[PDB]
Amino acid sequence: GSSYVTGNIQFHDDGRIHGSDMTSTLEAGHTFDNQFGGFTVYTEFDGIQLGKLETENGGAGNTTPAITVGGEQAFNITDHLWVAAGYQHLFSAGESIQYRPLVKIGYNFDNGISLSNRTRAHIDATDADAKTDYRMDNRIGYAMNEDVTFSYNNVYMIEAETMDHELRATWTRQGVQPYFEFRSQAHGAENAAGDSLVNNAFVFGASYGF
Amino acid sequence: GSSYVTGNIQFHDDGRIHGSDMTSTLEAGHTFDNQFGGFTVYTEFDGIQLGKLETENGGAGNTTPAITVGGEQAFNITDHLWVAAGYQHLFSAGESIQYRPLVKIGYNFDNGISLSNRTRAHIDATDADAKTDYRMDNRIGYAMNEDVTFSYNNVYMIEAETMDHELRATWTRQGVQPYFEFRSQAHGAENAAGDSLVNNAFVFGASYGF
Ligand SMILES: CCCCCCCCOCCOCCOCCOCCO
Ligand SMILES: CCCCCCCCOCCOCCOCCOCCO
Ligand SMILES: CCCCCCCCOCCOCCOCCOCCO
Ligand SMILES: CCCCCCCCOCCOCCOCCOCCO
Numbered sequence: 001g002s003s004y005v006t007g008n009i010q011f012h013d014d015g016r017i018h019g020s021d022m023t024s025t026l027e028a029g030h031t032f033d034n035q036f037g038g039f040t041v042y043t044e045f046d047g048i049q050l051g052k053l054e055t056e057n058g059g060a061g062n063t064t065p066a067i068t069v070g071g072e073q074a075f076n077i078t079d080h081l082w083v084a085a086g087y088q089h090l091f092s093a094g095e096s097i098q099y100r101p102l103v104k105i106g107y108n109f110d111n112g113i114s115l116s117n118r119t120r121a122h123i124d125a126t127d128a129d130a131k132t133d134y135r136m137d138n139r140i141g142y143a144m145n146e147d148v149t150f151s152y153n154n155v156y157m158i159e160a161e162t163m164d165h166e167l168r169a170t171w172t173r174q175g176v177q178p179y180f181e182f183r184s185q186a187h188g189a190e191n192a193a194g195d196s197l198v199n200n201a202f203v204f205g206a207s208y209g210f
Numbered sequence: 211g212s213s214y215v216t217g218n219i220q221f222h223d224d225g226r227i228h229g230s231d232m233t234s235t236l237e238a239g240h241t242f243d244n245q246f247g248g249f250t251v252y253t254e255f256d257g258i259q260l261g262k263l264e265t266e267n268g269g270a271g272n273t274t275p276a277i278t279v280g281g282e283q284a285f286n287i288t289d290h291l292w293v294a295a296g297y298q299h300l301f302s303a304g305e306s307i308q309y310r311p312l313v314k315i316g317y318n319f320d321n322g323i324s325l326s327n328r329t330r331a332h333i334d335a336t337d338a339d340a341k342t343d344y345r346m347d348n349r350i351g352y353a354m355n356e357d358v359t360f361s362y363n364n365v366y367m368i369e370a371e372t373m374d375h376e377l378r379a380t381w382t383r384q385g386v387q388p389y390f391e392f393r394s395q396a397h398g399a400e401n402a403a404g405d406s407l408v409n410n411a412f413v414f415g416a417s418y419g420f
């Protein structure tokens with residue numbers, strides 16, 4: 001068994017999709033051990049607003065944070081080919097926002113390359129009765145040595161047709177493992193006037209396993 | 211050298227002062243050891259809204275969280291008597307709210323009783339030019355054994371004449387140390403119509419030092 005915390009600070013060069021120029025995401029979870037692999041539970045506070053509100057021209061303004069609670073069970077198919085299934089639930093301001101079942105598959109090469117997909121349904125639980133969307137996170141990671149891992153993660157929303165590029169460098173030292181990440185977000189998103197909501201985030205973060 | 215995280219979930223029976231029926235406060239910091247003692251830098255997210263929004267009758271409604279960054283130097287004067295001093299900056303949504311210089315004093319007894327005071331000034335940093343108030347935290351704590359520690363903490367604002375009460379039990383197990391706390395807050399606070407704003411909260415939290 002093991003617990004873990006992770007989180008970050010995000011500086012946004014536009015900030016409208018987040019509603020603020022500075023946000024934070026924090027997450028804490030625990031992996032119970034069974035023989036299939038691990039069963040992990042977790043909670044994520046997403047979208048905490050720190051910086052100047054962005055309220056005009058498509059900005060989201062003063063939001064309430066995205067609270068996720070989630071469980072996931074992973075399975076090793078081979079020693080290097082694994083899959084998982086799990087469920088996330090999205091709450092916000094005391095309400096159910098979405099049902100989010102998810103599935104994952106990935107493969108880990110000996111040379112330090114690893115590949116993985118997460119496909120996550122976004123099923124509205126609110127009255128807006130919105131169309132179900134599907135988030136895909138496709139990630140390639142390179143652990144060049146035991147001291148640094150590099151990663152590119154593509155975020156794609158199938159229906160909205162929006163795309164995020166995420167590039168990360170992680171100092172995988174013993175103990176707290178800080179990381180820097182550049183996110184090029186919201187490619188495809190537009191405001192009412194048809195202007196681009198593209199956002200660049202500089203992200204400073206850290207993870208710790210115990 | 212030591213790092214630490216702490217955090218809680220707060221369930222409120224009147225969530226008006228918080229704007230919400232459920233909130234969280236979260237905190238992380240590190241202590242560097244020097245000659246005088248511990249120098250600790252930290253950040254706190256106070257007031258993350260998780261529950262149904264309270265907007266009527268003086269409720270704060272959709273707030274932005276209270277962000278503290280701070281630094282404190284502690285001095286072990288005797289093996290039992292310590293003092294500390296430092297500075298906290300409070301901002302919210304990209305705007306400095308208060309300058310918060312602070313001092314601390316406490317005594318730890320061998321029988322496991324400990325007493326402490328923190329006095330923190332609340333200097334208005336906005337254009338409102340509000341009279342500087344002073345916050346006292348007067349805590350008594352008892353470590354009955356290595357498993358459970360109880361504490362009482364009185365919170366008092368000198369000028370506003372408001373008072374909080376904090377009763378806490380902490381499971382000091384090895385690893386993540388969870389805690390229950392009952393809070394009765396905002397004694398002396400009134401909305402515009404003169405009604406008491408008193409809030410009672412059930413608080414579940416956890417901490418980890420490393
Ligand atoms: C009990 C609720 C748990 C929800 C998530 C756990 C959060 C624990 O970390 C608190 C961090 O305090 C905020 C400072 O942000 C720093 C960003 O870097 C990541 C911290 O590991
Ligand atoms: C139609 C647009 C959909 C976007 C797909 C772009 C994918 C580019 O990302 C590169 C990294 O992808 C890693 C591989 O994806 C998962 C492979 O895992 C399978 C291993 O068995
Ligand atoms: C606790 C904030 C400072 C970080 C730890 C260093 C000081 C440890 O000794 C202080 C003794 O207790 C006084 C703390 O009063 C409550 C602090 O609440 C945290 C947010 O400011
Ligand atoms: C003289 C009557 C004035 C009472 C109204 C204001 C009360 C504010 O003071 C609260 C202090 O009460 C002591 C709290 O006990 C905490 C024990 O630990 C303190 C160790 O320093």
Ligand code: NA
Nearest residue numbers: 062063064273
């Ligand atoms: Na808000």
